[PDB]
Amino acid sequence: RALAEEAAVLGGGLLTAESVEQAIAAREHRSFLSEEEFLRAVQEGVIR
Amino acid sequence: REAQEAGFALSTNGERLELTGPGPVPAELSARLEEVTLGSLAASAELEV
Amino acid sequence: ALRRLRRDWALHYLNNRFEPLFQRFPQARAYLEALRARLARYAETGEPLDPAQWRPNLLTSSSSGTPPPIVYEPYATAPRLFGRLDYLVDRGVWSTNVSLIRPGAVHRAQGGYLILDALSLKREGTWEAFKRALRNGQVEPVTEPQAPAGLEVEPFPIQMQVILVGTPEAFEGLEEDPAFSELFRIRAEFSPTLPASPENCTALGGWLLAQGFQLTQGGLTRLYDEARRMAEQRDRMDARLVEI
Amino acid sequence: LDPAQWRPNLLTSSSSGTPPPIVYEPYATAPRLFGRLDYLVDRGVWSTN
Amino acid sequence: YLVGPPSLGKHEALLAYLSTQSVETPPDLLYVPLSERKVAVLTLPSGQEIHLAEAVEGLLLEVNRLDELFRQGSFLREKTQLEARFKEAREQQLEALR
C-alpha cells in the first residue's frame, strides 16, 4: 500500500506500469548512497 | 397584546416572565411565553458579549 | 419527581440553546452535548459549574498556512514534544483543568511539518512515546507525579509530516526497530560529497554570494579546491557547506 | 453519610449491540488496562472513593 | 527522515525548502473537556475558535438563565400540579387512616 501511494504521487493519480516502476526505482535510489559511494570508489580505484 | 385578548396578564416578576390568569394558561400563550423567555436569556447573553 | 422535572425542563430548554451551535460548529458536536449534559446536571443535583473547567483551550492559530507551520524542535523532552500539563498549587493541592494544558510541538505543528533531531530523540528517551503518538494518535502531556489526577487526552488522528534530521550513525539506534521503518519510509540521504565540476563550482559561487560575501574568480577557485581537499577526493567537493 | 462515598460509578454506557465493544489499547500499561484510582487531595490527605 | 554528516546545514536548507510549500488553511487546534477529567483534541476551521469561545461563554452565563427559567410560570404550575398529585395520594392514605 505504501508503494502504491508512492506510485500514485509520482504518477499523479494513476498507477500505470511506468509510475510503479518509477516508484520502485526511486525507492531503490533513495537508499543507494552507500552503494553509489562504493561504485564511485571502485571507479576511482580506491577499492580495487 | 396577544395575551390580553383572552384576559391573561403578562407579569414581569423579576428577571423571568410569567402569565397571571385564573385556571390553566393556553398552550399558545405558554409557547410564546417560553419563546420570549429564551429570547430574553439569549439577548442578555449577547448583551454581555 | 422534582429532580426529574427540572432535568426535563433543562433538556428541553438546552435543545433550542444548542440547536444553532450544532449547525454553526458541527465538528464540536460531541463537545457541546457534553457541555449540555453538564448543564443538565446543573439542573438535577444543583451542582455548580466552573467556567474555567469547561472552556475551549486554544493551542495554535494559522492565518492560511502559507508557509505551513514548520515547528522546529531540536529538543525531544516530553514537555517540548507533547507539551506539559501546568497545574494550580492551592496551598499544596495540585489541581489543573482544560485551560492549563500547554500546547506542544505536536500540537504546534498539526497540519504542518514537525522537524526533530534523531540524536536528541533517542537521547531523551522519548522515542517510544513519539512512536506511539505517530502510529495511533494518542498524546500524553507531562503530568506531575504529585498530581491527584491527570487529564486523559483522547487519541486524535495526526496530520503532521514528521521529518527527522540526524547523522547516519544517529539513526542506527532507531533503525533496529521494525516499527521505525513502518512510520518512516522516505529516507532522504544527504550526499556527504558533491561531484566536483564547473557547474557545481558556479553553484558554490552563487551560494556564497547568497550568503552575503564578495568573492573573486581566483578566490572562488581556491575555495573550490579547498572544498575538494576537505573531501580528500580529487573528483568530489566536500558537501559540508557550513565548513565552507 | 458521604453521598460521594456510596454512589455507583458508571463505567460502560454501551447499550447497543452490533458492533460489540472493541477496545484496542496499543499502550498496555496497568493504568491503561485496569484503570487508575483518582484521588481527592483534601488538606494534603489523598482520600479516594 | 533526513540523514547526513554533521555541519551540512540540513536543518537550514530543509526549513528553507519547507517554507516555500503551501497548505490550505491548517485547522485551528483546541482542547474540549468532555468531562471533568477527559480532554479531547478538536480541529476547527480558522476563525471558528473565537466564535466557539463566545458561544461557550454565553452557555457558561446561561446558568443564571436556567435558574431564572426554574422560576417560570409554567414551571411553577407544573410543580404545583405534581405536588398536588402527591398530596392527593397522601390525603387518600390519611383519609383511610382517619
Strand order in the sheet with C113-117: C70-72, C113-117, C161-166, E2-3, C188-189
What is the DSSP pairing of strand D45-47 with strand D40-42?
A: antiparallel
Is any Cβ of chain D less than 8 angstroms from the Cβ of C145? no
Cis peptide leading into D19, omega within 30 of 0? yes
Any idea of the CA torsion for E35, E39, E44, E46, to the nearest 10 degrees?
120
Q: Which residues contact E52 (CB under 8 A, 6 or more apart)?
A: C25, C28, C56, E30, E44
> Dihedral of CA E33/E39/E40/E45: which sign?
positive
What does the block give as the cell for C60?
Answer: 495554535
Q: Which of E41, E66, E69 sits opposite C154 (nearest CB)?
A: E41
HSE toward the beta carbon, residue C107, CA cutoff 13 A: 29
Resolution in A: 3.5
Most C CBs within 10 Å, among A44, A46, A47, to test the C interface: A44
Long-range contacts, stretch C190-193, CB < 8 angstroms, 24+ apart: C190/C239, C190/E2, C190/E3, C190/E4, C190/E5, C190/E8, C190/E10, C191/A33, C191/A36, C191/C239, C191/E4, C192/C231, C192/C238, C192/C239, C192/C240, C192/E4, C192/E5, C192/E8, C193/C231, C193/C233, C193/C236, C193/C237, C193/C238, C193/C239
How far is residue E57's CA from residue C49's CA, in Å, rounded to a whole number? Answer: 12
Is any Cβ of chain E less than 8 angstroms from the Cβ of C157? no
- Which residues of E fall within a CB distance of 8 Å from B15? 68
What is the DSSP pairing of strand C152-153 with strand E2-3?
A: unpaired
- Closest to C191 measured CA to CA, from E14, A45, A37: A37
Specify the CATH number for the domain of residue C215. Answer: 1.10.8.60
- Which residues of C fall within a CB distance of 8 Å from B42? 17
Q: Describe chain D by its helix, strand, coil percentages, rounded to 5.
A: 10, 10, 80
User: Cβ-count burial of B48 within 10 angstroms (0-12 exposed, 13-18 middle, 19+ buried)?
Assistant: exposed
Inter-chain CB pairs, C–E, below 8 Å: 227
- Bin C44: left if φ > 0, else alpha if -120 < ψ < 50, else beta: alpha
Residue in chain E nearest B24 by alpha carbon? E77
**Element at A7 (helix H, strand E):** helix A2-10
**Element at C223 (helix H, strand E):** helix C217-230
- Bin A19: left if φ > 0, else alpha if -120 < ψ < 50, else beta: alpha
Q: Which of helix, strand or coil describes residue C166?
A: strand
Q: Which of E8, E33, E63 sits opposite C239 (nearest CB)?
A: E8
What does the block give as the cell for E41?
Answer: 483534541
Domain that holds residue C203: 197-244
Other C-beta atoms lying within 10 Å of the C-beta of residue C241 = 18
- Closest to C120 measured CA to CA, from C159, C81, C158, C71: C81
> Dihedral of CA C97/C100/C105/C111: which sign?
positive
Find chains touching chain B: ≥3 CB pairs under 8 Å: C, E
How far is residue B39's CA from residue B31's CA, in Å, rounded to a whole number? Answer: 12
Are C164 and E2 in contact by the 8 Å Cβ rule? The answer is yes
What does the block give as the cell for C55?
Answer: 472552556
Q: Which of helix, strand or coil describes residue E89?
A: helix
C contact residues 197-236, partner E, Cβ 8 Å cutoff: none
Structure solved via? cryo-EM
What does the block give as the cell for C99?
Answer: 485551560
What does the block give as the cell for D21?
Answer: 465493544
Name the β-bridge partners of C193: C238
Q: Cα E64–E68–E73 angle (5° rounding)?
A: 170
